[PDB]
């Protein structure tokens, strides 16, 4: 057929009977670092089975009056086993992710999602003088959410979570220029993207620079008649690919 896929990595597997095609970044497939571009003076390490697998983040509920969700990418896997462990002892490191989000519904529900992965997503504070603090900008594999109301002004260090501006001050409609897929509960069941390493330096630290952001914005809100299941959860499972690190040090 042409509806089924079977993705495997490391020692994990993802299978979906009903899904659309897979969108591969900007046309490039994630690979290691060639030696024309390398800048580190030493030799990097490559676990290659201990990290390249599918970690599963926490779940989120898709209520009728939902607004959105976002995860900061090389920060959400900070606590997932060997990836988070190699992310601490080293100093540099590049990766390439294979994001997969999955939300299933029956044939009697209706709704739609926009699964976009905006690179270098800089967000704006609620107060025009301050900037958002770390605690309210991201969470360890936890989903921060947008809102439908403009956040007030008396808040000191918070994020402006008005969804019609995507938090970045940009129009929410024009977000499709980035790689994306639509979760449409009519015909689609799962969206999957393959995002290479996008940054202006060959390697970078991973505790100070969240060089991606996976957003989910419900355009056509969920709706159903009385009787059907009132609880429809969403679950995203992210998997690094072609990872390597440099510069050993102590823990931090």
């Amino acid at each position: 057929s042409d509806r089924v896929r079977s993705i495997t990595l490391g020692n994990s597997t993802i299978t979906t009977q009903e899904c659309a095609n897979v969108v591969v970044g900007y046309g490039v497939w994630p690979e290691y670092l060639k030696d024309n571009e390398a800048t580190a003076e030493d030799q990097p390490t490559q676990p290659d089975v201990a990290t390249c697998r599918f970690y599963t983040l926490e779940s989120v509920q898709w209520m009728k009056n939902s607004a959105g969700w976002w995860w900061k990418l090389p920060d959400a896997l900070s606590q997932m086993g060997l990836f988070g462990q190699n992310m601490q002892y080293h100093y540099l490191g590049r990766t390439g992710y294979t994001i997969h989000v999955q939300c299933n519904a029956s044939k009697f529900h209706q709704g739609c999602l926009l699964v976009v992965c905006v690179p270098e997503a800089e967000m704006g504070c609620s107060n025009l003088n301050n900037t958002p603090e770390f605690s309210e900008l991201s969470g360890g594999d936890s989903a921060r959410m947008f809102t439908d109301t403009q956040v007030g002004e008396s808040n000191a260090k918070k994020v402006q979570t008005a969804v019609w501006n995507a938090g970045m001050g940009v129009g929410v409609g024009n977000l499709t220029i980035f790689p994306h897929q639509w979760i449409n509960l009519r015909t689609n069941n799962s969206a999957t993207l393959v995002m290479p390493y996008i940054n202006s330096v060959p390697m970078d630290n991973m505790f100070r620079h969240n060089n991606l952001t996976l957003m989910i914005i419900p355009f056509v809100p969920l709706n159903y008649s009385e009787g059907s299941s009132p609880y429809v959860p969403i679950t995203v499972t992210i998997a690094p690919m072609c990872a390597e690190y440099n510069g050993l040090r102590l823990a931090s």
Partner: protein, 111 residues
């Protein structure tokens, strides 16, 4: 120059010690001499010019304020306000000026 929080709201009880922090970092394009001020709007209350302190300016607050850190050229302009009273409500301005940068911090203290 850049202050971590250009304005916030602080609340302390009368008779406590008031912490009014003022942190900053230094961009590469800053190489001039250091200058740090502190204002109050109910008027300078303490200066740091030429690596020496001049802090007898506000008669209402004599000795009731003094810098905390011993590395004032590293990004610490905080002041230790002790023995809070009722006539100490007013907006503070941590004005630091290193050539050629400038940055402020508006601390509105309420009690």
């Amino acid at each position: 120059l850049s202050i971590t929080t250009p304005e916030e709201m602080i609340e302390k009880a009368k008779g406590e010690t008031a912490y009014l922090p003022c942190k900053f970092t230094l961009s590469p394009e800053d190489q001039g001499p250091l200058d740090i001020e502190w204002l109050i709007s109910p008027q300078v209350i303490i200066l740091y010019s030429g690596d020496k302190i001049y802090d007898d300016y506000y008669p209402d607050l004599k000795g009731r304020v003094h810098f905390t850190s011993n590395d004032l050229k590293s990004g610490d302009a905080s002041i230790n306000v002790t023995n809070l009273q009722l006539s100490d409500i007013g907006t503070y301005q941590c004005k630091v000026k290193k050539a050629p940068g400038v940055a402020n911090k508006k601390i509105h203290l309420v009690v």
